[PDB]
Amino acid sequence: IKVRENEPFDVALRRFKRSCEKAGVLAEVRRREFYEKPTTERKRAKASAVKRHAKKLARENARRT
């Protein structure tokens, strides 16, 4: 949100914005509260995350490489 980036800068370098505020809470509230689908997408995201974790736990195979 706030940064100074002192006088010999010539560039923005505002990486603190996109880590926290700039997009992840911004382009989700302009439309569609959905009243339920945050819970559905949280279920789907954590399901995909635990399936990726279970696949990485079983990724040790031959794989011809």
Binding site: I1, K2, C20
Partner: protein
Amino acid sequence: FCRFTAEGVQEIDYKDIATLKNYITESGKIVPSRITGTRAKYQRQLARAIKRARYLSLLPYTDRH
């Protein structure tokens, strides 16, 4: 994994803002438990202490004032 509250007897209080300041970011937001340990009992008590210190103007809600 390096939580100060896991072996931390005399549970986290609102008054000692020196150690309580380490669990908010620069924008005043609460540091998650997915980064710095802070198991869920002490995490919920820490969130209570954070917002009860924000109520007493001991810690800022944010820097937008």
